[PDB]
Design a protein around this ligand. Structure first.
Ligand SMILES: CCCCCCCCCCCC(=O)OC[C@H](COP(=O)(O)OCC[N+](C)(C)C)OC(=O)CCCCCCCCCCC
Ligand SMILES: CCCCCCCCCCCC(=O)OC[C@H](COP(=O)(O)OCC[N+](C)(C)C)OC(=O)CCCCCCCCCCC
Ligand SMILES: CCCCCCCCCCCC(=O)OC[C@H](COP(=O)(O)OCC[N+](C)(C)C)OC(=O)CCCCCCCCCCC
Ligand SMILES: CCCCCCCCCC(=O)OC[C@H](COP(=O)(O)OCC[N+](C)(C)C)OC(=O)CCCCCCCCC
Ligand SMILES: CCCCCCCCCC(=O)OC[C@H](COP(=O)(O)OCC[N+](C)(C)C)OC(=O)CCCCCCCCC
Ligand SMILES: CCCCCC(=O)OC[C@H](COP(=O)(O)OCC[N+](C)(C)C)OC(=O)CCCCC
Ligand SMILES: CCCCCC(=O)OC[C@H](COP(=O)(O)OCC[N+](C)(C)C)OC(=O)CCCCC
Ligand SMILES: CCCCCCCCCC
Ligand SMILES: CCCCCCCCCC
Ligand SMILES: CCCCCCCCCC
Ligand SMILES: [Cu+2]
Ligand SMILES: [Cu+2]
Ligand SMILES: [Cu+2]
Ligand SMILES: [Cu+2]
Ligand SMILES: [Cu+2]
Lengths: 236, 382, 382
């Protein structure tokens, strides 16, 4: 069996959900979403923010708790074939993390630039912001934490210790979410011009750099793949 | 749509827009709508806002639903940032061409280099038609007419696709062979020196030479075509001509100003001294995009936005005609739902509880006088 | 010699020099030459140049071939930086004393704190004699006359040579023994503790004590001699007195201005309104150190530099006398080889294609009027 169709679902769920989110923000961007003090803004974007925050907290708790509770206690008695299957599942988790990272840190971040570059921002919770920081970021944080936990709890290579590159790849992009405080503080106070290259934005950049730890993470996963079932063929 | 969130005192004391007019309220695609009016730069410019040494006359709108055909300060076109003087009154004119159908809230705004957006009154303008009918023709000094909607789009797409294809070809050339794990094992276990061998080096040399040669040839071709080019035209424009307004014949001294918390009314006591030779009457109080009118004295006919217009929102304790030379003190109340809708009541949250505004005084013959008032605004709770 | 490289529009709209005069064209060593004139700070000061809050009246020259004896703005000496006001006209006077023989291109220039050099017209001045004959005497408040060419030179040489000799003595004392490789081997192989032993420590203590004592004694001696000293005198000088020019009786409105690319001519259409009570005629157009003259109206007699002077470079379509109260529109062409020699045609490369200049209008009796014009400058290619 080895690599199964969980990868198709991993791609499709993010693609479909974010396409629907884009449709929603295209429909309610203007017209209930321009005026932050209008009653329709509360029903179409503040309610969205509340619901998405509650659902993200619940989903993160449930997913992480399930992954930690179903952790493999007897990692020693794991056959190489099962280890290969678990390595493929972890690679599917990493693919989902990469897809979510794309959707969060490229699509909704830059689309955000457009939003701000076109309208006068009315609040810290613009309909679009709600989408980026309160969805395009918690979703990829949840996916990254889940992938890290799966590696630690199913892969003997990633067990017996916390991998530094994986921890950086998982936590650095997470630090972008608390960095939103610097974004707000340095939008309203510091810097009144809508410039995407203003220093109030270097907190997003610095912690975006930590995603480069995916390189060490991926060579670690390559070594984990090539533990018992490394071949032969490769180097033979 | 971006105001009602800015600080009430900052909206009150930055820039006062008046004599605003709109040529049309409903337009077709490609039809032009003109916005005219005057703005006065308040003398008590807040220290937190940089002085309007570098300011841009902008339009508040949800993206290019209109295109700014022209914009004027004084009588001269202002496509760049301009320098404004504190205390001066300028007249402006913005010409917009409809591009996208719908109902749009169009604001005239002034962006200041170190203070952010100063949004004036916004008016709903209806656009009907189809976006596909929109044209933005322009004639260059080289004698060709192009449509700015799609000019150079094909060339941009072609060049970007070409370079993306070159990069993808490089990556795929290296990706035909196995990529990650066997190459990693070969590099780790002993010297590799086997995964990069001729003609890989020849292919890379070809890629490098072709890239440099194609860049040079494309630049030369883009220089032979379009032989006449100019850099981007930028730079703040000085010498904006302000309006030479006559000195007002009305002097007003604000003796305290209060507003109820909570409430929708603002109360102030004014000592009005009438100079000149005509009986005056208080007709309007404009504070921040909100016009409180005394309907018995003046009526608005310029189609001011209804949510910003208080037809009878200005009540004067004694608004009888003020004979020349006579001085009297009256209690003026400006009350309207706009005071709470546009969050002018939220000056209680502000770190500077001072207001500014314009009082419009009208005589019998109809000629009007504009006087500016500013004073601390004291909340009242009991 | 540093202009013709600066941006054409920046040379056009910073500072306009006019009424320039030179006392002499050829001088001897120690002889004085005086440069006089007026400069007007343009109202449309470019935003890329900091406002002339801190400005210095300098001389453009290849090193001290002259010494600046005196310099005045208004009527007062300006050895320090000064504050200038935008839109004001100031008169200046620089006194130069010849120091080095040769043919020198002397410019009057204004350095602005945050904008760099603004170079005015330059004139060739011949210096004859020998540099050895140059003297720069000055009398101090302590009652001694010194020559600034060689004053303190001996003392400076002596002290520098003394301290250099002390350092060389230290180095040579340590360099008598073998230096690099045996000492390195001794330090590496085992503890060294043998290459620095008494009386080396005694010699170092002597060097340190002698250095401190000599510094203290020299400072005390240099305080007993020259007991009266003052710090360097610095600081921007405010309150420069501008010229109180009468309000011009001529108003000019520029209706478009064009220049051919390539070409040596600039064309503009002006609407001239003559107020006052005398028939006026356009005699000069000054744009950037270049004077385009209508020879039928005015002739230059102040010895203006020939390469900057267009004697008949100004052609007016109808330069008949303009009766008072009369308004007419004429086509004015300023054409000369200077327009290309001084790269005023390179405004096509500039990111701000706007020009500024001065128009000089002369009546029958000879009294002149100065009016300032500024407008966009549109290139024409076909
Ligand atoms: C990592 C964990 C992430 C957790 C957060 C998830 C956020 C989900 C959206 C919040 C909506 C909100 O809050 O708003 C509630 C909205 C407000 O729209 P309405 O006014 O009712 O109009 C009618 C509804 N339309 C405008 C959508 C037609 O209505 C709803 O009930 C519909 C929400 C549907 C969400 C599920 C579909 C997603 C695409 C399919 C692939 C997954
Ligand atoms: C241990 C080390 C930690 C130190 C960090 C503490 C935060 C500093 C707070 C500054 C307050 C101050 O000092 O003054 C506040 C000054 C006062 O200026 P103003 O006159 O109001 O200007 C008016 C201009 N407005 C209207 C736009 C404000 O506003 C500033 O210029 C803010 C400068 C930015 C400093 C924050 C940079 C954070 C770096 C983030 C990159 C990851
Ligand atoms: C070894 C490398 C050294 C780095 C050099 C840093 C000094 C540059 C700052 C100059 C300030 C300035 O002048 O600002 C320039 C304009 C501000 O425009 P304005 O508002 O018109 O400024 C008017 C008032 N000024 C000009 C006096 C300030 O944009 C900026 O804010 C600077 C953007 C910097 C982008 C480049 C940094 C890339 C980030 C990489 C790390 C994540
Ligand atoms: C609406 C939310 C639905 C999330 C569904 C989560 C599925 C449960 C997670 C999980 O444990 O594994 C699911 C799959 C297949 O891996 P499994 O083998 O089921 O995982 C345990 C491994 N073990 C069987 C050897 C013990 O592993 C995967 O690759 C699933 C990837 C799912 C993409 C991540 C979605 C997260 C959105 C916030
Ligand atoms: C918010 C920012 C995160 C800060 C980063 C700190 C975490 C980084 C290191 C890390 O993840 O290790 C914690 C464990 C991995 O196992 P260990 O750290 O070895 O310890 C396991 C026992 N423990 C679950 C109680 C911790 O991983 C887990 O066990 C997590 C799953 C259990 C938590 C589920 C409950 C959370 C619901 C919200
Ligand atoms: C790899 C990222 C793909 C992002 C594509 C996207 O944002 O799609 C939205 C956009 C919306 O434009 P349109 O297709 O005209 O449909 C408009 C519907 N709304 C306004 C809700 C977006 O176009 C599509 O939906 C095309 C489907 C692409 C599938 C990968
Ligand atoms: C890594 C490079 C960081 C350079 C910082 C920078 O460009 O700051 C520009 C800003 C100059 O402000 P300015 O660009 O004039 O802002 C104009 C808009 N307002 C006045 C509203 C802020 O300077 C500061 O306020 C100090 C920045 C500290 C960085 C750790
Ligand atoms: C207004 C001048 C701002 C200068 C900022 C310097 C940033 C340097 C970062 C090391
Ligand atoms: C090393 C490659 C240098 C290429 C220079 C090309 C110059 C062409 C002038 C138009
Ligand atoms: C440790 C050496 C300190 C020297 C001080 C000398 C003071 C002299 C006063 C004129
Ligand atoms: Cu931001
Ligand atoms: Cu609006
Ligand atoms: Cu005002
Ligand atoms: Cu020279
Ligand atoms: Cu001038």
């Amino acid at each position: 069996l080895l690599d199964k169709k969980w990868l198709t679902f991993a791609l499709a769920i993010y693609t479909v959900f974010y396409l629907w989110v884009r449709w929603y923000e295209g429909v309610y961007g203007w017209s209930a979403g321009l005026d932050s003090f209008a009653p329709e803004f509360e029903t179409y974007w503040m309610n969205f923010l509340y619901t998405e925050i509650v659902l993200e907290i619940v989903t993160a708790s449930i997913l992480w708790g399930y992954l930690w509770k179903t952790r493999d206690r007897n990692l020693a008695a794991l056959t190489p074939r099962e280890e290969l299957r678990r390595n493929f599942t972890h690679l599917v988790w990493l693919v989902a993390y990469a897809w979510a990272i794309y959707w969060g840190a490229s699509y909704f971040t830059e689309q955000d630039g457009t939003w701000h570059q076109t309208i006068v921002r009315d609040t810290d919770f613009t309909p679009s912001h709600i989408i980026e920081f309160y969805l395009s970021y918690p979703i990829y944080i949840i996916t990254g934490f889940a992938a890290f936990i799966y590696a630690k709890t199913r892969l003997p290579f990633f067990a017996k210790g916390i991998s530094l590159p994986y921890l950086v790849l998982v936590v650095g992009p997470f630090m972008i979410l608390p960095n939103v405080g610097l974004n707000e503080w340095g939008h309203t106070f510091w810097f009144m011009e809508e410039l995407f290259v203003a220093p109030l934005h270097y907190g997003f950049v610095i912690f975006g750099w930590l995603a480069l730890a995916v390189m060490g993470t991926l060579t670690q996963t390559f070594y984990s793949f090539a533990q018992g079932g490394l071949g032969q063929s490769l180097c033979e | 749509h971006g105001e009602k969130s800015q600080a009430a005192f900052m909206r009150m004391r930055t820039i006062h827009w008046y004599d605003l007019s709109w040529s049309k309220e409903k337009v077709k695609i490609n039809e032009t709508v003109e916005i005219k009016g005057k703005f006065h730069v308040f003398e008590g410019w807040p220290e937190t806002v940089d002085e309007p040494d570098v300011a841009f006359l902008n339009v508040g709108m949800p993206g290019p639903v209109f295109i700014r055909k022209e914009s004027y300060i004084g009588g001269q076109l202002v496509p760049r940032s301009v320098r404004l003087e504190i205390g001066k009154t300028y007249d402006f004119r913005v010409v917009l061409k409809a591009r996208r159908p719908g109902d749009w809230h169009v604001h005239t705004m002034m962006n200041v280099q170190g203070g952010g957006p100063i949004i004036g009154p916004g008016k709903w303008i209806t656009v009907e038609g189809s976006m596909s009918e929109f044209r933005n023709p322009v004639t260059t000094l080289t004698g060709q007419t192009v449509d700015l909607e799609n000019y150079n789009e094909g060339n941009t797409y072609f060049w970007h696709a070409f370079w993306f294809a070159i990069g993808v070809a490089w990556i795929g050339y290296w990706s035909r062979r196995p990529i990650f794990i066997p190459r990693l094992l070969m590099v780790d276990a002993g010297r590799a020196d086997e995964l990069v061998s001729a003609t890989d080096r020849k292919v890379a040399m070809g890629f490098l030479a072709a890239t440099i040669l194609i860049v040079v040839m494309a630049m030369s071709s883009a220089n032979s075509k379009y032989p006449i080019t100019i850099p981007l035209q930028a730079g703040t424009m000085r010498g904006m001509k302000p309006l030479e307004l006559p000195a007002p014949t009305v002097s007003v001294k604000v003796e305290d100003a209060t507003y109820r918390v909570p409430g929708r009314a603002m109360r102030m006591k004014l000592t009005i001294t009438n100079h000149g030779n005509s009986p005056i009457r208080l007709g309007e109080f404009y504070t921040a995009s909100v016009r409180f009118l005394d309907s018995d004295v003046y009526k608005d006919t310029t189609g001011y936005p209804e949510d910003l217009l208080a037809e009878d929102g200005l009540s004067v304790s004694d608004n009888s005609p003020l004979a020349p030379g006579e001085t009297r003190t009256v209690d003026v109340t400006a009350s309207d739902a706009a005071w709470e809708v546009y969050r002018l009541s939220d000056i209680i949250y502000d770190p500077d509880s001072r207001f500014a505004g314009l009082l419009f005084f009208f005589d019998a013959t109809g000629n009007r006088q504009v006087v500016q008032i500013d004073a601390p605004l004291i909340p009242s709770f009991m």
